[PDB]
Structure formats: structure tokens, C-alpha cells
């Protein structure tokens, strides 16, 4: 059934599962033409497929060439996502295939289910949570590898860096989503907060700064303060 606040700790048991987020699969810019009509220009995008227990991210890059000559692209984009997630599962050793896939948007259920018919025992589930994975293109190193791609490409990351060496996946995922929530609500401020201090760097193999335990605490408090301020602003509260 649906994932919600109640069955939230199931994400961190030892049953393998993936989140799928499709919000950045089909991305466009809107502009005016010479005659003064409006046209879209697609840019490269991506599938955000994530094991919340281990941090393994399967970043499938969606090259604009995929759209060439297609109609009803926002609909096509849901089927492509399902096609790519299916191919990933098929590519994995049996003992590595997920027992569940959680889609972040209910429109993906039907395309994935159809594409997963070969895997009747993999459960496709929606969620009521409001996860912020659409901000994943505010993570510089992810936006760069998508925007520089010249063909379809799969790129593997750990979205937790080495955090799990010191914290539980419960805590890791909560830090991940607080970070992404801040980036989504005010990207400029969020980024200012992460990178204000030049003496704290990002390892070549990492996505985020190598904060110490105490510094992570100051960071998380800043992101919370950011989120609440933006909320007060949005609603005049």
C-alpha cells in the first residue's frame, strides 16, 4: 500500500527497495519564436532512482535526442522512465533486484506496472510523502553530469557520501531530505549555507562538503531556519 508517515521506518529495514522520481526526466525551456508564438526547447534530464538504505543512486541521464520526433512528450516521459527502471532491474543480479519500487508521483504506477509484468513479485507502490527529490538538479555535480552528456548514460553515485560510516540510514535519509527541501525552497540561500566557508571542501568522489559531526549540526540548524523563514514568507504567517 501507500507509503506515508506511519510506515516510514520500512524504508530502512533490510528488504531491498528503490525510490523512483521522474520530475527531471523531461525538462524544457519556454521561449518566443520569431513570429511571436511560444515554443519549448528540451534539455537533458534524468531519472532519480535511489536505495534509501544504502545511498546508492542510479542516475539515468535522459538525452534530448530521446524526444526527437515524438508527440505527447510529458506522457512519453512516464513510459521511458518505466522502460529504464525495468532495464535496470533486469541488469541487476537476482539477489540485488528490489522487492519494492516506490514512485514519487502516482502517474508512474501504471507505466511501471506494465513494464514490470515480468517481475510479478516486485511491488510497485505510491507514497503520500512530499519528497523533495526534484531538487536533485540543484546538486552541482549531478546537474553537471546531466548537462554535459552527449548520449544516453547511466552514472552511479552514493548520495550519502561517507555519512553512513558514522550515522544510521534513518539519520542519513533525514539529512538528505532536509538538504533537498532547503535547496527546493530557496536554492540560493541553501547553497550559500553549504559553501560559505571555503575551508570545508567536497571530496572528488563526494557530492557534499566534508563537514565534521558538529558542523553538520550547525548546517542542519541553518537549513531548518531557512525552511521556516521561507514558509512564513510564503503564507504571511
Amino acid at each position: 500500500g501507500a507509503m506515508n508517515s506511519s510506515n516510514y521506518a520500512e524504508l530502512f529495514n533490510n528488504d531491498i527497495k528503490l525510490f523512483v522520481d521522474d520530475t527531471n526526466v523531461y525538462r524544457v525551456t519556454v521561449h518566443k519564436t520569431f513570429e511571436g508564438n511560444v515554443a519549448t526547447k528540451a534539455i537533458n534530464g534524468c531519472i532519480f532512482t535511489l536505495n534509501p538504505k544504502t545511498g546508492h543512486l542510479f542516475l539515468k541521464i535522459i538525452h534530448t535526442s530521446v524526444w526527437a520526433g515524438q508527440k505527447r512528450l510529458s506522457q512519453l516521459a512516464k513510459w521511458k522512465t518505466a522502460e529504464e527502471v525495468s532495464a535496470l532491474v533486469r541488469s541487476l543480479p537476482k539477489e540485488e533486484q528490489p522487492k519494492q519500487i516506490i514512485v514519487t508521483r502516482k502517474a508512474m504506477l501504471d507505466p511501471l506496472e506494465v513494464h514490470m509484468l515480468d517481475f510479478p513479485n516486485i511491488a510497485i507502490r505510491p507514497t503520500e510523502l512530499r519528497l523533495p527529490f526534484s531538487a536533485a538538479m540543484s546538486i552541482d555535480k549531478l546537474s553537471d553530469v546531466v548537462m554535459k552528456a552527449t548520449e544516453p548514460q547511466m552514472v552511479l553515485f552514493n548520495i550519502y557520501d561517507d555519512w553512513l560510516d558514522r550515522i544510521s540510514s534513518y539519520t542519513a535519509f533525514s539529512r538528505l531530505t532536509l538538504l533537498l527541501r532547503a535547496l527546493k525552497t530557496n536554492e540560493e540561500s541553501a547553497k550559500m549555507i553549504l559553501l560559505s566557508d571555503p575551508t570545508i571542501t567536497i571530496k572528488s568522489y563526494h557530492l557534499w562538503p566534508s563537514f565534521t559531526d558538529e558542523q553538520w549540526i550547525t548546517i542542519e540548524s541553518q537549513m531548518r531556519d531557512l525552511i521556516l523563514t521561507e514558509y512564513g514568507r510564503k503564507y504571511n504567517v
Partner: protein
Amino acid sequence: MNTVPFTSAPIEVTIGIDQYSFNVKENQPFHGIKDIPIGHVHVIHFQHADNSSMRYGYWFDCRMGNFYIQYDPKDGLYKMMEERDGAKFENIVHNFKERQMMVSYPKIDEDDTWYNLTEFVQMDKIRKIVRKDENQFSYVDSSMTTVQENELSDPAHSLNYTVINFKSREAIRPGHEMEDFLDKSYYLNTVMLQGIFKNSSNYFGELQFAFLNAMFFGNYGSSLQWHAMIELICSSATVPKHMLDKLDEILYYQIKTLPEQYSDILLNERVWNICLYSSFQKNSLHNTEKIMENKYPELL
């Protein structure tokens, strides 16, 4: 014209014969129904005055034997039986008619209603859906579950309708996932029509038998099956011109005959709004759409 005599009527019951019905009182001298048009399938059905639950009945065809009703006080219901002795049967029928103890199948001559609801219904196909091959007639009731329902318990008493499932390997060809799931023409025309039904008349007959079981017994699985068969066609972009014109008629008479008060549990909101306004076939059911809008505008 044919006759179905009853031995007696020991308990108070509402009797249906096709789309007609009559109240019969406990131990009223009632001995059967006469003047039944040869040439079609028929259904004779029962609702005890004491148990408004469980409507039950029998599909039959008079060309396939001499059939009669007899109440069984062990099992508590009106049972259809076959008399193999032709002479003995003419003898009972003639004696009861003479004693005028029979109601006349009350057909208005302008009225093709029943024909139009059973045009494609064959008794040979019925007896594969309700498998009980020691009998030439077929028993159905409110509570009988279908084979697809049994999958998601007793198989002797199941309705073996043809299983339709939009999210199955049957329905979806590998590599044409998106295509086959948005445009079901492959599933309708190759898998179902050419594959399983062989022709549109058998498809149409099951559709029609499913609706009539839903309508007469409130059989929930039969309503499910009816709506599935409609959706498959309406969600197919390529459908023989002759099938669409016949479907529009089929559905017209079905909507026209339904009890107005039952339109809430017998008509699935989603499927009909899809067929009439969203599907490929939205413009192809002109009689069906006109009668739905004018009789059941609320549901849309």
C-alpha cells in the same frame, strides 16, 4: 410457441420470464408459462417473498428439450427439470392449458426488446460459462463468483467468463508496452477476437449474457465482465466498422431496459465517461450517448 409447465407453486414468489414478471401467492394454483417465442434463449427467474436476497434462475432454449419447474422442499427452491417422455409432457401441458392455469408470455408485437438483448446469445456458449453438462439448461444466482474473481473458491459453481486483464502479458506485447496499453487494438482484434472468441458474434454474446446476469441477479462479477468487454473495445483505436455500429445498438437496448433505480450500482462511472467522452470511440456510440445523457445525466 413453447410452454414451461410448473408442477405447483408451494411458496410465495415473484417469477420472471425474460424481462417480464408476475407475483404468485403461496399454493396458488399456478401451472406455468405458455406462448414462449421459439427461436431465442430465455431465462426464468425467482425471488422468494421471504428472502429478497438471492435472486436465482435458469437460461434455456425450448428447441433443446421439454423443460418444467418443480419446487424442491429439501433444497428450498424452484428447480428446472427436463421431461424425456414427449408424450407425457404434451399430456401435462395440454391439460393445464385446458384448465387455463398458465400465464401467457406477454409479448407486444412491435417489441424487439428481448431479441435485441439476446441477438448474439447462444445456449451452447452459455453452457461453457456455467459448466453443468448433465443439464441442458443453466442455473445462475446472485452470489455466484466468476473465474477471475476466484483468482483474486468452488469451481463447479463459478461463471467461467473470458478473463480480460489490461495489465497482463496476454494484453501487452513485450516492447510495445506503451503502445499496447494505450491502444488495445492488438488485444481486442488478435488476442481476443481472432484468438479466443473467433468472431465478434461470440464476443457480443458473452457481453450480452454478462449484462443480463448483472441485471437479473445483480451478479456483481457479471457486471464487472460486461464493463470490461465494453472498455476493451472503446479503448481500441482500430475496430471493425460493423462492430461499432452493432455495439451502439447493443448498449442502447441495455441502457434502455435497465431499472432506473439500479443505475447507481449497475453502471460504472469511470468506464462510461471514458467510453463516451475520452476513448478513441467517443464519437461512435451516438445512440448510446444520447440515451445515457437523457436518462442518466447525473452519472456523467
